[model samples]
Target: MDLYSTPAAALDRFVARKLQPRKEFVEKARRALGALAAALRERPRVLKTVKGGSSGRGTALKGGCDSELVIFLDCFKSYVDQRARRAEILSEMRASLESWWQNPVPGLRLTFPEQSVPGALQFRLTSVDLEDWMDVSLVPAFNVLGQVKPKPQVYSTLLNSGCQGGEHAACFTELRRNFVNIRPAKLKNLILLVKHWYHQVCLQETLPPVYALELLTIFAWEQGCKKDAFSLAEGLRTVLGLIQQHQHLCVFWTVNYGFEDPAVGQFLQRQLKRPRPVILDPADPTWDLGNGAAWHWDLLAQEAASCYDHPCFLRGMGDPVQSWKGPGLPRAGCSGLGHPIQL
Candidate 1:
């Protein structure tokens, strides 16, 4: 088979030519971020700042890119402090931004929404030079993990507090960035391909979060093909195959947190049994990516089936490429006969 000229090559070429974020756009994003950081640094309570979203994680695709600036504030001394004073802090930061605008960063413009978003200061950053724009959310968070990896105590404290799930997710932005940032570049490229296909092909109002797709891609890679290099066609096929079988998804990562302490273990046990698709956020255990009951996974799964015959998956001779049948399900197994469930 002439692999170089196959439909698989077309997929590769499309990603390279059309899907990758333009060089100019990336440069503009960096300059805009730098300008915003400089403005934010003037605030007294703002301790640190971190970039987030596809752009931050290096999984951004062409056509569109958005980012977030998570500002760690000393005022939010604890998770409780964040819950109580988040609106107050947002008001202060919004005022700060408005004041900063009097002598704002040159070559870039910031505009806030007509109506306020509850948890974040939503704004638009536009570059006069590139003429490209990205939506940026300034989130005020407590510095739970400061310049150090989180001990299990961090999670256990949240668990015992009975705080709402995923409420404090923004606090773990650094960890979230680290999780994806540590993955192989080839895998990140694969994520770009998957994200492009999702945006291009899966055209529905209610679909799974793009973050879920990223996790699913990583899960498919780790479970089925843990290697430095692999066929892009096969990789895409594997992800699509997993999407079709989303009902059996129970993916969780233990890189940061696990079911070791009794409080965390018990909390996780309840979380795992909540629904069919239980993709726990790797960084924040409280967040469940698969909790979207209203999402149209069925439609996406149908699209996945139809996409098999698409050019990208067809061989040079027109035979359809077979996807790797990834380990049947990513179930956190219920082992240990008389002991606690081991995930």
Candidate 2:
């Protein structure tokens, strides 16, 4: 098949060549992960370890990838404990990693941060040739919710617990992973395509979080084309169209958590009213993807507009493919005043 013949074919080819992680690189990453998992398993304080990031959700791109290893420690019994003892735990783990680096894993060369941070200790695991590497972050978190779905009180306490926005998102690693992991394969490929574009266009610029883009892709899919298979070109175009109008975006998901609870509902109302481009994390309510410091949306929107003319948005006849017109907000229960919510 001529992959470049049509916009959809061009997107498929792009994902195949530039988005999928190579098998050899994946194997090397697995080995490094195995070494870290084995070494960390020896610690008594570590209850369980879960993977985060694109690798964890199976949407990683080619050439590079970041693997977030979230360690649920027994010492942190509550969210407040995670904040209070995070510094001490990070220092201790840094020491352990430093000691282990002496006789590091055979093929993988590890590099640790010189200065310590209160959060995760990020380290780089590189191949011998340095052509491929995995950026791994060992995050220490409290396991507030176990295997079962989290209850309302779990989020309610977090709301009133003095936790800043997006402070303990790592704690809900499983929830975050499951959100994307449960999606269809084609949808993930769309996410990879969007991420690939975001990296290429927004290189080195302080912009919105990539997670926001991920959620935006999903939102585009759910609202515009909720199907087993759809045109990738249209999907990408819809997302780009949304990006162009980010100033009016108010997005959230209630699949895992919702506004049924009084505290959560009230808090969500206030969150929705804050500003435009409000992208809420489904797992952690406190996390608003667009709530951080000001991002370069004008620049990104410019790129988004320019991307419309790319061949990927064109048909074999050279006409532009019409994108799905998806709304920024979910239709049901958008106003949290006195309406029955719908999924």
Candidate 3:
């Protein structure tokens, strides 16, 4: 794939060429969901309910594409009121689904089951005042985005990371700037690093106020230094900042990387008071104690491996790279396996 491709074109190609087979199904499912939305809007019993794509938690299956249609509802205070409202909401949602199913488009299927919310009192509805939401996912049999070829840089990074497995181990490909490519394997490691960085910064509490210093540190790591050690450290800081800022943003590091709450963002910025780079001097005795000497070897080795082996890793390095198996692969949400999505 050309490194100069526009993000729009790259995204379009991912959704069209890579996941073409499921495009029709996804469209049909979307329309069905639209109908459901319309029905809900007409008789909304629970205050607010909206539908949208997967929150990035649901894993894309072999040929199956996973997307969510979330429905947000308000909490009630009284047990009787809550029970009555919950029943009404469930009935309305059921009817909406049934309506959509009846007039469903040709290539789509709709399934439903009773969903329960944990921690909510089953009987004391009036006492509970919280936002209750339901998530509806529209999964297609294949992901169009996975078919497109990812940028070479992304693959290179994964290979360099000591990644193992074939296409089955791969997940999604993401492109940021014209020259920057991100593969699932690299993303996984990046996510882990980000989590670790957050923990390091917020060792004192759940959340802290630390942004200015952290941002500078990240900028230096991503742009200032040429070494992977610096870059990786900076990348970790950057991602941790993002998580701290947008805790709701799910960390899509790997196929199995689960969901994270958005509140983590606040916790991060709160901790970064007056951040400054830990400048190390060669002659300083504290060099080994607070400098690169301690973790440089391991960090550099991992970075080198990710940079070199990412491509082969995406192509299923352990086995012969082949065309992606459609829905034949397992879904990451429920099943742990994932297929590489070309981008």
Candidate 4:
């Protein structure tokens, strides 16, 4: 009822609802990605597969599901700048789809955008194919510009850090393998805990990361129950203490609590800063708690959402460097009905 009875319970609800459903969605999307790859194989103009998802790594679960494919084509990369390229790609994509009009499912559609990044194009393909549906996106290999290439070192790091089984592990592994530089410092354990927590709160067997974060943040800040600021603070202190015990193995622990008004911010700052502890503010512009503002959670969900479909998170877990590629592949066979693939 209070802000949070205990950090563990708050985290439990948060992870179960916010993070876990996306993992499930990714699993479903993987099958769809395989099918889409097969379809693109017939179109040699697409070039080789680069990378998939938003996390930018192969080991991370972020990009695996909402499959983004990367490819190379002669005329496609001719744009002088990303703006031009995006316009050109959108136009060409529209024309290309004219002949490939196969509405296998209802409420399904596709969009091609010339990503700002060089040599890459983005494709957002949606379909209502699966029962517990979500969206499926693909990126082409050529669309990769200056984005960090995937590597194996990061994957090893995640695995070494103690990633368990399930979709979360799979995605994390993919991210680790593909994107090497995005690795978190001492936050690895925190991330792992957060991942586990999201899986437990899942409702309807599927929920978007944004919605999940919203649910959890709301639950954490609920006014009535036994949970409150004191308990949450205690739990955070404990986690921080654990991290300190393993300081040699990780980076600094930074906490980002969201609040919309100056009053809540002041209250939290005082509570967290008292023990001479370190905390990190997100510097968010939309964190009002007085008027029942909930967008702060949405912002957190957005940060988590970025990992949902990026291959940058997959570099080190599987393939070698250069094996890392771009975005926007294809999602014809992917399972679901949402726009961005929310598993």
Q: Which prediction has the highest TM-score against the true structure?
A: 2
Candidate 1 least-lDDT 10 residues: 334-343
**TM-score of every candidate:** 0.88, 0.89, 0.31, 0.34
lDDT of 3 by residue, 64-127 (tens): 3333443434443322232345455555555555664566545543444344431121111010
Per-model lDDT: 0.74, 0.77, 0.29, 0.31
lDDT of 4 by residue, 1-343 (tens): 1112223335434433433335544544454444455455554265454443433232222211233454443443422222334455545544444434452223444555555433334455444443233333333322222233223332233233332211122222222223231333212223333333343333212233321222222222221122322322222222322222221111111122223344444543443332211111111111211111212333323434333222222233533112111111112453221211111
Model 2 regions lying over 4 Å from their true place: 1-8, 113-117, 326-343
Measured by lDDT, the strongest candidate is 2
**Model 4: runs farther than 4 Å from truth?**
1-6, 9-18, 22-24, 55-67, 74-85, 95-177, 180-189, 192-343
Ranking according to TM-score, highest score first: 2, 1, 4, 3
Q: What tens-digit string does per-residue lDDT give for candidate 2 at 168-247?
A: 89888799999988899889989998888888775536788788899889988988899979988888888887777677
Number of clashing residue pairs in every model? 0, 0, 58, 117
lDDT of 1 at 89: 77
Off by over 4 Å in 3: 1-21, 44-49, 55-62, 72-88, 113-343
lDDT of 1 by residue, 46-118 (tens): 7889988777777877656667788888877668777788777788888777766776556566766665555
lDDT of 3 at 36: 63
